[PDB]
Amino acid sequence: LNPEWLARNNDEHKIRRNDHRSPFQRDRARILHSAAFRRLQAKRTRLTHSLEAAQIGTGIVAQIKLKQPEFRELLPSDSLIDSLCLAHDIGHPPYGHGGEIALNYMMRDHGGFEGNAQTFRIVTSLEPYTEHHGMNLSRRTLLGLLKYPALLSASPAKGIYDCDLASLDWVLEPLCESDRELLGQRFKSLDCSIMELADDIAYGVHDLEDAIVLGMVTRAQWQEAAAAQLAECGDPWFEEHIAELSEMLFSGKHYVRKDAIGGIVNALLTSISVKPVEAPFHNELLAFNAYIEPHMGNALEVLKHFVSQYVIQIPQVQRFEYKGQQLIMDLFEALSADPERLLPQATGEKWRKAQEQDEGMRVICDYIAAMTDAYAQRLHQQLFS
């Protein structure tokens, strides 16, 4: 595969002579040392979720290159698939989905807000590892973060901000004309298909375990909603093992729940394969995605839907999101009231510079999107309490 997929947007820095690491190992190190990644500890934290996703992602790849050796060379290296799972959630705003909706509404006339768009914007521009190119990651890694590789102009709509079109053009630059015109038509790269599967499996299964010990789900509710749906989900392993897994998850002993969680995770990984994308792509990274076997896919959706209605769709969480979304709107209206006097001094400078292109609002949105919940509340207390 083309060495253009290993390239960075800028070559000003020179790799040290003693440094024999791959471009993707350097990408992983950049993300791990970045302020955006460290913030995931505030946001079982988002950093914990991303570490689990990285381990599943490398487990998926290891499993695929055993069942399909022909693709051993095509598949992402361990440090690349790690990089996409450590970076995938850096763009989420304070207060999760409540934060996203507020920011999107406050930007309704200036490009909106969306978390995956924000991830792309952080790594290509906001993280100041370089002065002008963010973390300046290699092209293939950047392509792996484009879960929706079209512009938003084409709840927020998934896409890339128009203010980042230059860096999106750079990422897709080595693709032939027709591959680019299919991409905007729903479509994603192989590496990103793997990262997505790792993220869902981690969400479905690893949120579930401490939901049990915290008492947020009792055995009756697991049997009534998840365990019954899985006995009829159509995959033979789950229909066979569901009863035995339900007793391990409610064992009350960690060394038994761990065997259940490990068994569920492993069953999902072994049901993933590379199949051809069903469209006339020429580039191998868009012609193939990783897919989970459909029945095993049904079981994953039972786990995802179950964790969402008993961990997320409960009033204690939903009231916190309502608070968060009111709180974010308060900050946005105050800061845009007089940005130059209320923003931190450095952010005020970027706002002045950004106003020559009438992008002052995107700067305020960047600033809020990068706050933790503790930072936003304290800022809210400084402006209103």
Next chain:
Amino acid sequence: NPEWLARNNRRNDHRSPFQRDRARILHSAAFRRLQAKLNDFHRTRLTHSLEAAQIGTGIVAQIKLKQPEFRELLPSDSLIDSLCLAHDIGHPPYGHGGEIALNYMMRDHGGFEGNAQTFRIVTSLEPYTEHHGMNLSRRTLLGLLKYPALLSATPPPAQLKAKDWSPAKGIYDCDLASLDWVLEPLCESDRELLGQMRRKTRFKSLDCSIMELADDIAYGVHDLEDAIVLGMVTRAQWQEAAAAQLAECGDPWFEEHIAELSEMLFSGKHYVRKDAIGGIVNALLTSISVKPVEAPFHNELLAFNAYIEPHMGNALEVLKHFVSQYVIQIPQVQRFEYKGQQLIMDLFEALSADPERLLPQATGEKWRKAQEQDEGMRVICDYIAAMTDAYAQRLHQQLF
């Protein structure tokens, strides 16, 4: 010997023993707790451990390039990763302040010490297995013995003074079985030399000497950047303390580059400061080699350590001393530790007043079982030792 890959206790899992140790540590509750221990600063013990791990793998890469003789002996990436991810697992709430309190409250029951606690967590407390903690491979455990002696080998009397109750360093006597297991494939001559004192132990394995250097480099440099932007050190204090001492430290690179390094650190631009940090880190890494240990050790993991070049050692010691003088030994940090040590001592005295009634039920049950051996206090100590600051603050409020 393959005995170093053995544990105390799937078809498609073709990972090395050290890759499995890394995954266990990454998944452990003990590791996740390091995230807890108006700006946007989020440097934790967890981030400190990731940076140490990345320096550790870089150290191994430099040794395998300059000293091929040692390529079979040096630790794999995941083994050095595992030792840096775990090195800070045993630290109690409130850092040294917590440690002083627990040690004083355990004065008659084996004491408390963070490295001992780290050994105790991975060999027993973390409930990944029923009876052997994370059940790590023998060589990984050996890499964690920064002080491979018992606290019986390594009393103060008489408001509390920090100097009087800083713990000796070593392994708890109640974990002797798991220590005996780790040292089992050693000849008697290596074993009686390993517990030799300089009381302060003198020796450690090659894997652990590498982790110690990576930890020391991480502590020295990666605290330094945020100290500068938070205003905890001014340009003037950097010149008088660090820069002047580095101009006379004896290493030519630092004497040559200090002037330009100081202007880059105070540039005010992250993309410039990182190049100073990267160059300091790289200058330190590239100055490490494996040499023989000055003791007639027979086992190769004990006959060789990694050492930093001495003049380079002075530069590292200037940086470590500087972060201690302007980031740690400041009244703002020390009062937080005094408060924490008063807090830890309150929890211990209340909980030991009646453990069955006040402990959470699961910990109360462990306390009852442990009283058959009269080791109840260590159970209270493990419980307090595994709290975060926030959990301890909440428990304290429920009690006072």
